């Protein structure tokens with residue numbers, strides 16, 4: 001506060017302002033004033049991300065857009081649960097100390113000292129993050145990353161943090177795509193368009209395994225150089241096997257309608273029956289307010305719809321768009337890759353935009369998928385400043401940080417991103 | 431290997447029932463499931479929350495429901511109202527509104543002891559109606575063991591008699607009386623469609639009789655601040671004003687459909703707008719596994735209704751009860767309040783029994799309410815051995831040698847109530 005406290009107030013004014021004049025049509029007035037109002041709180045963060053989320057539904061309902069239980073049922077949506085057991089799988093894989101060994105194992109696999117070790121770290125960050133979490137994975141990775149440079153002290157110069165520490169934060173964010181879980185933007189794409197685990201994986205996984213080298217290499221030239229729980233490991237693999245091949249498997253049992261969730265809910269089940277994780281540790285590791293957030297953004301979408309806003313937008317958007325894209329259109333949306341670097345919460349960014357862009361592509365009768373993936377894949381591309389995203393913050397503390405060296409470097413990457421994404425987006429468009 | 435084996439038995443029992451039960455199919459499933467489930471919730475070999483996730487998963491694999499529609503139960507509007515509760519308390523604790531209400535009421539008795547212990551009971555009950563029990567208990571403990579210091583005596587009771595039981599029990603009696611804390615009361619209102627103000631119509635005057643009674647039978651047998659936490663109290667009061675008056679307010683609006691959920695939800699706003707409590711705190715405070723349990727439990731009441739196991743059981747007991755009750759029923763249903771207690775688990779108990787009793791009572795052409803209320807209130811009547819409830823299990827340090835002492839003192843209490851619930855419940859027959 002009082003900043004945040006007033007901003008809300010400013011935003012209430014903004015709403016009342018739009019709501020009361022903005023003549024248009026009443027139910028579009030609603031959608032817009034609401035759209036804008038929520039557009040603010042989630043950008044910045046004037047309230048907490050999760051609060052505004054819980055704000056969304058009560059604002060439908062009152063205003064009569066929905067009825068309480070229907071507005072609420074948004075939270076029960078299946079991807080949320082897919083995500084929930086994503087968390088569970090991590091939580092277990094942590095508390096049994098599986099990740100600890102992975103790094104200890106792959107790092108030490110580097111044999112001697114430094115040279116290769118650094119890159120090892122990068123991969124293990126990306127691989128590990130694929131599954132666990134960005135910040136979490138970055139945080140955990142950081143202390144091992146300091147250990148690798150000790151006799152590597154180097155008042156001169158860049159290796160200690162610039163590169164390796166900065167590399168890590170970046171790897172942490174890159175393999176954050178590549179899997180529907182996590183980070184949460186992927187989840188929110190998936191919720192919106194109804195992607196399967198492997199559906200999303202088809203896109204991210206490769207985009208990730210290119211953007212990674214591209215990033216580290218860009219990074220390189222602008223700097224440089226100098227135990228019984230296998231059950232967990234196995235339960236992990238089966239759950240992931242079940243996810244990839246979900247299609248034939250589900251096909252082959254009949255049904256099943258959102259298999260990937262049952263596969264996931266199926267993990268927490270086998271994990272807790274196998275006695276390899278306690279629910280306390282699930283409940284802690286689980287970010288309950290992202291799951292809450294998912295539903296917020298789902299409710300938003302249905303608001304944009306019932307209200308008529310999502311169609312109105314596309315109407316007004318029409319003449320303009322028919323002239324430009326899709327190649328200019330996706331260059332341009334992919335240019336909100338620059339936009340997760342300013343106040344982000346890539347989550348809250350994704351939370352805001354995907355509903356808007358997917359549900360307009362719907363009144364144009366194209367697939368909400370392309371934009372919805374891209375927007376989400378772009379939001380994870382946040383580099384160039386702490387913060388967000390937090391892995392940046394994580395690395396920014398301690399040894400020879402930069403603050404303008406992030407700034408420089410993150411610019412050449414963020415661009416080779418906006419380029420690389422536009423590139424791929426175009427290919428899958430064939 | 432303990433628990434895991436109990437699980438195997440539970441699976442062995444299921445396969446038995448599934449293959450050998452001689453009725454239709456849907457009933458074979460329904461019964462089969464009501465059994466395996468019940469076995470797992472009573473005991474707890476799975477945890478609980480794990481069990482609750484299981485309800486939906488079976489239900490969709492046996493085709494009873496489709497994935498979402500099953501999952502949609504998790505988002506029922508009462509879970510949110512209970513989340514509401516959790517934040518209201520997340521806040522009043524974070525601020526110290528609990529300690530203050532406690533300290534200032536307690537110390538108010540000036541000269542110590544006699545008035546001061548009874549001071550303690552009223553406070554613990556007040557603090558419970560809103561916050562929690564386990565929470566409210568562990569909080570009262572130190573404050574209790576301090577109040578009794580000057581008498582450290584091996585002579586004798588006055589800790590293990592009036593203090594620690596009178597404390598632990600006051601938590602539980604205050605457990606009732608409001609929809610928020612502990613969960614059974616929610617579970618009931620959840621299934622039979624009760625408002626905050628309805629459930630108090632019963633629960634409150636029930637906990638007011640009951641506290642003195644638990645205190646009487648327990649006798650004859652066995653600095654301060656005030657900071658800006660004042661706003662919290664204002665918010666709290668206001669929330670409780672709308673909750674009480676929800677009825678005439680709502681209709682002076684129209685709708686609104688689950689107004690009390692809105693009211694609760696709005697509380698989460700007012701609180702976090704007033705910069706009085708963070709999400710970090712609401713999240714750490716809330717018991718997500720209960721919220722989760724709430725839903726999966728609901729999924730189960732729905733499994734009964736559908737598979738027609740509800741009328742199976744209803745028709746099954748048709749002769750026994752039609753010539754038996756009602757009186758005998760309620761006396762009997764209540765007297766299963768000796769249940770909890772042994773092997774206990776006050777929540778998980780009510781989580782099995784309400785769906786069951788509620789949905790039969792419907793099958794009989796009877797308002798679900800009265801029974802389901804009774805079952806919850808009863809569910810909180812845990813005295814004699816710990817656990818459950820945990821309040822019991824808390825107060826064991828020091829005069830904890832009580833052991834039998836509880837068992838003894840508690841037996842009268844248990845029965846005392848078997849008469850009391852049966853009285854009120856019959857008078858409520860109007």
Ligand SMILES: CCCCCCCCCO[C@@H]1O[C@H](CO)[C@@H](O)[C@H](O)[C@H]1O
Pocket residue numbers: 026027058059062063064065
């Ligand atoms: C926490 C925020 C509380 C906001 C409550 C404001 C409610 C105002 C009602 O709007 C209504 O919308 C309808 C269309 O949907 C119109 O038909 C109707 O004429 C109009 O009255």
Ligand SMILES: CCCCCCCCCO[C@@H]1O[C@H](CO)[C@@H](O)[C@H](O)[C@H]1O
Pocket residue numbers: 269487488491492493
């Ligand atoms: C993680 C625990 C979940 C495991 C549950 C597996 C249940 C599969 C059985 O389905 C049932 O089989 C019958 C024939 O065999 C069919 O007639 C019927 O349609 C169908 O209801």
Ligand code: NA
Pocket residue numbers: 129130131132133134175176177181182183
């Ligand atoms: Na991640």
Ligand code: NA
Pocket residue numbers: 558559560561562563601604605606610611612
């Ligand atoms: Na309580």
